[PDB]
Structure 1
Amino acid sequence: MKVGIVGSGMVGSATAYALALLGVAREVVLVDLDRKLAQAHAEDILHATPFAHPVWVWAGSYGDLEGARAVVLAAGVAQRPGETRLQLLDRNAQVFAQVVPRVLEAAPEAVLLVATNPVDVMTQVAYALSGLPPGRVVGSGTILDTARFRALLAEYLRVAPQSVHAYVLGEHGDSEVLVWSSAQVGGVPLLEFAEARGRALSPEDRARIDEGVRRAAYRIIEGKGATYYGIGAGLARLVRAILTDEKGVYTVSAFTPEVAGVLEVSLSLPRILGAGGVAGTVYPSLSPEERAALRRSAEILKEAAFALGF
């Protein structure tokens, strides 16, 4: 079935591309302020379809979003020199104040998947503006970082990543929490199963993995100036979760009534994703340190929200 993407820039277009190569959705509609850009991306992708899957990819207006199961909000403004993360945040909040109602007008049944950075806050803004139930608005959140964590662990232990269950929670960004505490492999505690293999996870190792997960976006942005590909494919996977009513577990950003003592904040927790959006929350055990860090992350997300008027 059908998926909308509003915001046709690098992230939007990469998401479309991934949807198309993976054969997730039958239909993909690109909507962008610059009409010509969306059309160009659409046609470029359309060129690729014959080498993967019969996906109808096209550019249109908000109205064309009718019936989309999900709409990804990838929109946002040109970064501007000598402008505080705050001013940018403001201009984007304004973009979303345009976009959300219009998307909802056409496709009142859709789930909104929020892309645009910073993702937790934008997720808050969209939840606020949508007047939908909280679970209908999902931010992409920490999924890439969680996946990378699982990957580095997998690689350390010489085990399939699929057998590694570990989480990254909180703000997607520097304050994100890697939960080492309750992490497991094959359903047994990580660090135990570390001895149980020949591989005791020195704090130095812990630190090496942390750098690996934490600084990946920074490096990507330093070398190429933006991230698209990873998130494009993550968004694709979430869109697939939504369309197949998978009810699978992903660490995503949503409005949470209370987390670690903080009230009414959007951030990433493991959540059950399916056709109506998120349908349930999974609480892994946190150590006191991790809980404290989560609490901090949430606090700071919450003050951001407040500073912006959300």
Structure 2
Amino acid sequence: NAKVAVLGASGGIGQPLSLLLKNSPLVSRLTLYDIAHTPGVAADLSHIETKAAVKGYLGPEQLPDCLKGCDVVVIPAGVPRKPGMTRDDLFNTNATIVATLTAACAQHCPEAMICVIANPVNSTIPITAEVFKKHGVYNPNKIFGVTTLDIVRANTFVAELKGLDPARVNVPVIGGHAGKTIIPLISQCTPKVDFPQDQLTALTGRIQEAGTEVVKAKAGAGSATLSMAYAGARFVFSLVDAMNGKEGVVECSFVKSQETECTYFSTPLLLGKKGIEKNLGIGKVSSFEEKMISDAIPELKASIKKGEDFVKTL
């Protein structure tokens, strides 16, 4: 009986994401928000033979009605990358977007799970947290930076190289969601896999640059949409399952953390009825993986401070 809001539902990620959500028997009400096209998207989806009641909402005047009574809010809203851009180049525009939408969440559904897809996640989660603090309703167990696509990619790339079924591969990925902050823990992969250091370095590099690879491949027509819809759907379903009392639900996500000196960090999280049940931590890692964690912390701290400083000027 989960009530889910999608903010940015008319965009490239938002539409196929809303489809996957509508198709699931976990969702009872699907409220869609954007600045354009939502009524059409809602009409389209409302015809699908599943139980989820689909409602479309349009413009900041209707945003409160979209959020009212929501259990989960997913935020794919945001400007995508063009070839040559870094995720950091999107900060100025997407920071304003996230601050506005999460302010409405703080006011109208403060108890909801907030899942931010909007890049750069390393900065937009700190923004979300500070906005919630401003409204006096900050719960760090309920705010999630969606990094699930990194794990999905890692699983796929490991499966391809080792001739495995990616459905039965699980690579923990930690740190953040940008460049060298993406740290795939191949040593913790199930099933156990052994790559030589040159192949391991190549695999790790491809995981880190996978987003840019897709941006390049689309050649100006945006960034990952369909795989991001898949990964965002996976995360929401995991979260909704856990809220309904499903046990053993573990997902990596960029959250308020005390695992490192970084105040926000991605690690495997046991999810439960109140959101984050337990942060399962970094765990035992190789020297190579330790080196990556060390190199990533400087950029993570910088991205975090950037997001915090943006909210200070509001």
Q: Which range, TM-score by smaller chain?
A: 0.7 to 0.9
Q: 2:78 & 2:190 partners in 1: Cα distance? A: 38
Question: How many Å separate the matches in 1 of 2:273 and 2:160?
Answer: 33
Matching residue of 1:268: 266
- Matching residue of 1:190: 193
- The answer to whether 1:277 aligns with 2:275 is yes
Q: Deviations over 1:153-199 (max 9, x none)?
A: 234334444543422211212211122233341xxx433xxxxxxxx
Amino acid at match of 1:236: A
Aligned-residue RMSD, C-alpha: 2.7
Aligned residues: 289
Paired-residue identity, %? 22
In structure 1, the gaps of 5 or more residues are 192-200
Q: Which moved more, 1:123-132 or 1:38-47?
A: 38-47
Contact 1:115–1:139 (8 Å) recurs in 2: yes
Contact 2:239 2:275 in 1 (8 A): yes
Runs of 5+ consecutive residues of structure 2 not aligned to the other structure:
none
Per the alignment, residue 256 of structure 2 pairs with 255
Matched, 1:181 2:184: no
Query: How far off its partner does 1:138 sit?
Result: 0.5
- 2:294 corresponds to 1:292: no
Determine if contact 1:113/1:138 at 8 Å carries over to the other structure. Answer: yes
Which secondary structure state, in structure 2, belongs to the residue aligned with residue 267 of structure 1? strand
State the partner residue of 2:130.
Answer: 128
Q: 2:66 aligns with which of 39, 64, 67?
A: 64
Mapping of residues 20-31 of structure 1, within 5 Å: 20-31=22-33
| 1:194 aligned partner | none
Cα 1:57–1:82 shift into 2, 3 Å? same
Q: Are residues 85 and 114 of structure 1, via their aligned partners in 2, closer, same or farther at CA, if it must alter by over 3 Å?
A: closer
- SS at the partner of 1:296? helix
**Could you tell me how far apart the structure 1 residues matched to 2:273 and 2:231 are?**
17
Counterpart among 202, 205, 216 of residue 222 in structure 1: 216
Superposition deviation, residue 209 in structure 1? 2.9
The residue that corresponds to 1:231 in the other structure is 228
Q: 1:87, CA displacement in angstroms?
A: 6.4
Deviation of 1:129 after TM superposition, in Å, equals 1.3
Q: Does the aligned pair in 1 maintain the 2:152–2:231 contact within 8 Å?
A: no
Corresponding residue number in structure 1 for 2:149: 144
Aligned mates of 1:135, 1:27 — CA distance in 2: 23
Q: Which residue of 2 aligns with 1:42?
A: 42
Residue in 1 aligned with 2:303? 304
CA distance in 2, matches of 1:305, 1:54: 40
Q: TM-score of the superposition, structure 1-length normalised?
A: 0.82
Relative to structure 1, is the Cα distance of residues 163 and 223 closer, same or farther in structure 2, using a 3 angstrom cutoff?
closer
More strand by share: 1
Q: Determine the C-alpha separation between the residues in 1 that align with 2:165 and 2:199.
A: 19
Distance 1:279 1:298, change over 3 A: farther
Matches of 1:121 and 1:281 in 2, distance apart?
20
Aligned to 1:11: 13
Structure 1 position 240 matched with structure 2 position 237: yes
Q: What is the deviation of 1:140?
A: 0.6
For 1:198, the equivalent position in structure 2 comes to none
Q: 1:83 to 1:116 in 2, by over 3 A?
A: same
Distance 1:126 1:218, change over 3 A: same
Match of 1:156 among 144, 153, 161: 161
Secondary structure, in 3 states, of the residue corresponding to 1:17? helix
Contact 2:29 2:54 in 1 (8 A): yes
